[PDB]
Amino acid sequence: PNTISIGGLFMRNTVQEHSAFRFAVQLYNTNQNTTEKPFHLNYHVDHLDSSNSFSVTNAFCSQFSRGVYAIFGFYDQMSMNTLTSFCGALHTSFVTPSFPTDADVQFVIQMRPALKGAILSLLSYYKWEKFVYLYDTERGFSVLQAIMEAAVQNNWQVTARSVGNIKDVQEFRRIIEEMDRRQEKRYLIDCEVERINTILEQVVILGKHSRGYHYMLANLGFTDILLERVMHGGANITGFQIVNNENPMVQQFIQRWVRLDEREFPEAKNAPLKYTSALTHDAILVIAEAFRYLRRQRVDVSGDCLANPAVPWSQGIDIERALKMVQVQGMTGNIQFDTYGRRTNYTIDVYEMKVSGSRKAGYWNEYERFVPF
Amino acid sequence: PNTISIGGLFMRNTVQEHSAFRFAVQLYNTNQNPFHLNYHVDHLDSSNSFSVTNAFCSQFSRGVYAIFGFYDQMSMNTLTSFCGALHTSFVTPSFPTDADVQFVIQMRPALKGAILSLLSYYKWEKFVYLYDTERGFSVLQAIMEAAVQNNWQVTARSVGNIKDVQEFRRIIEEMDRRQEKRYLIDCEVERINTILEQVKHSRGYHYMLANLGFTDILLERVMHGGANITGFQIVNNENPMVQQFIQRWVRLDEREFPEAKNAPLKYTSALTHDAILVIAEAFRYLRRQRVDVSGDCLANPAVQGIDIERALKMVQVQGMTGNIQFDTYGRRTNYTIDVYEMKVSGSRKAGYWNEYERFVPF
């Protein structure tokens, strides 16, 4: 077919990601290619509320009813298990920059790389033995189980705290006092960007955590963190990023990115690049490269959401083998996937922000673990 | 109308409930006095959230008045949204919901309540907490929010992912370095029993099983060890209405009703009989007022049904779980929980618990 149409699912607080989505379609459509574009790319997108699972399913069905060849979307802890299961039976590849699933789910392509390995290698590098682990239920229990798996082999004094339920900010002040009784100077934060910032604000008010302390923020949106007031007290801060600003392709992309009009592209000017928005663009790069390979193979690409009728099997299976076949050098390093859709062959840029200085500490890849230069 | 049909949904490992759901209708269909009852059964997959929607929309197209069934944690999120939006009342002996939702009548009473008073009767302050990723975070949060109010140091363990039966022993051998002997288990029977299977650690230990299916738990294996075990039951053997069911339930056709003589009457299979008793009186209350009762499974056009949810949540009937009344959300009220103590000393009935009366030991 001349025009491949893909499904879009965008929840709340993904405003910039939507702008990153619309632009990623335009730069491919504007060709210009005898070879880079053999087909045109369209999309129909439905904004939704995640908590209500009914709203999640009907959006998916309305997209499938249209006959889309791929679906790009988002999920929380609640909507995760539903969307992965619907794609597993209807055989439709689900592209997402949301947190990687603990289970070996099929027809799910996970753009966000796993931090699971990057943390443990650095905790072995820093040789931490007595530290605190603060976490929410949002990112998943993979990392909550991951450290308990290996920490007992190295005997580490780790203390866990669930904060996803805590709404009161006074509760955030009393949780830290408990660790000072256990003489804790080292902290590992595993929350979403928006949450991480709120307890760092509590560090300012209680005060004197400035010096001798160490905060490791297990989140890829390190730029979107308010680090300012913590820096000037004497704290050692280790953070994680996938995006490298030295990359000429990213700088090539940014020169165009700041130009976009607000009425057509929200949060493009006012807000800085969120890591999820960068993955949104790189998600298109995978879809584009997979479908270019599809007419390279010259394959005629193959409804209703009903269990009883019996879903077709000749459909769907063919796209997965070619989507997870890709090796595209994009903004987020090297984009490759395993059999389950998880990322592999990715470089994680490690940043050390210390009172004395602020610099890139090193890089992380699965083979060489952590390299500190 | 002279006949009302209620939708039926069943998961895996629910055979005892299947026949108990069947037999309760056969009792009702023999009268003896107002309207005929019908039911449709769908056998679904728990983990897969695809078959749940399929079996639900198949039940709804038939447009059954009230849907009965069970939910796994991966499927509970499916029915809670669907029953609320398509306005169809749900009846369940499965775990109570954590969040405040509408259009479901939860037969299973509150497990959370009894624990908060019974731990103070024993003066417990340091214990181990083994929880599941099945019944929800409601019980774990009830511990966590109360641990700061009464100053208790506890170790809550995520044993839900433990599939291989070797990790258990590695957790217990760490517990004796922290030299604590008290235990609080909040898991399902198929995983509760395996803990007691993987029990040196018998003399001077107290286990607390936070599950209403006390009978089906294999504990006599650990009882000779002399370990103390506290259990909870809503099924009352002293109740004359319970034995009346059992006398016909046991001496029942095995071909039509499997697991009738194969296994003891579980609380899930007990709550299923009471689930018909809630439906029967709610629809007879609708008969008192004559309330007239009246497709696709898509939300575009949208889509009545507030009719029955209103009457199901008000009922006051005596079943096999004794008192059955409902809160706005569908949770039990004015109910009574029996607590059992198993001791090397003796085996006995410690007392009862209700929301108003706290704990009573006679």
UniProtKB/Swiss-Prot annotation, chain A:
Q: Which residues point to the Extracellular side? A: 1-373
The record lists glycosylation at N33, N236, N345
The disulfide bridges present are C61-C305
Please state where this protein is localized.
Cell membrane; Postsynaptic cell membrane; Postsynaptic density membrane
Quaternary organization: Homotetramer or heterotetramer of pore-forming glutamate receptor subunits. Tetramers may be formed by the dimerization of dimers. Interacts with PICK1, GRIP1 and GRIP2. Found in a complex with GRIA1, GRIA2, GRIA4, CNIH2, CNIH3, CACNG2, CACNG3, CACNG4, CACNG5, CACNG7 and CACNG8. Interacts with CACNG5. Found in a complex with GRIA1, GRIA2, GRIA4, DLG4, CACNG8 and CNIH2.
Q: What else is known?
A: The postsynaptic actions of Glu are mediated by a variety of receptors that are named according to their selective agonists. This receptor binds AMPA (quisqualate) > glutamate > kainate.
Briefly state the protein's biological role: Ionotropic glutamate receptor that functions as a ligand-gated cation channel, gated by L-glutamate and glutamatergic agonists such as alpha-amino-3-hydroxy-5-methyl-4-isoxazolepropionic acid (AMPA), quisqualic acid, and kainic acid. L-glutamate acts as an excitatory neurotransmitter at many synapses in the central nervous system and plays an important role in fast excitatory synaptic transmission by inducing long-term potentiation.
**Which family, according to the similarity comment?**
Belongs to the glutamate-gated ion channel (TC 1.A.10.1) family. GRIA3 subfamily.
The protein here is known as Glutamate receptor 3
The organism's taxonomy opens as: Eukaryota, Metazoa, Chordata, Craniata, Vertebrata
Where in the full protein does the shown chain start and end, and how long is the full protein? Answer: 25 to 402 of 888
Swiss-Prot record, chain B:
Q: Where in the cell is it found?
A: Cell membrane; Postsynaptic cell membrane; Postsynaptic density membrane
- From the record, give the cysteines joined by S-S bonds: C57-C297
Look up the domain of life of the source. Eukaryota
In this UniProt entry, which residues form the Extracellular topological domain(s)?
1-362
Name the glycosylated positions: N33, N228, N334
- Recorded family membership: Belongs to the glutamate-gated ion channel (TC 1.A.10.1) family. GRIA3 subfamily.
Record's function text: Ionotropic glutamate receptor that functions as a ligand-gated cation channel, gated by L-glutamate and glutamatergic agonists such as alpha-amino-3-hydroxy-5-methyl-4-isoxazolepropionic acid (AMPA), quisqualic acid, and kainic acid. L-glutamate acts as an excitatory neurotransmitter at many synapses in the central nervous system and plays an important role in fast excitatory synaptic transmission by inducing long-term potentiation.
Q: How does it assemble?
A: Homotetramer or heterotetramer of pore-forming glutamate receptor subunits. Tetramers may be formed by the dimerization of dimers. Interacts with PICK1, GRIP1 and GRIP2. Found in a complex with GRIA1, GRIA2, GRIA4, CNIH2, CNIH3, CACNG2, CACNG3, CACNG4, CACNG5, CACNG7 and CACNG8. Interacts with CACNG5. Found in a complex with GRIA1, GRIA2, GRIA4, DLG4, CACNG8 and CNIH2.
What does the further note read?
The postsynaptic actions of Glu are mediated by a variety of receptors that are named according to their selective agonists. This receptor binds AMPA (quisqualate) > glutamate > kainate.
**Protein name as catalogued:** Glutamate receptor 3
- Species of the source: Rattus norvegicus (Rat)
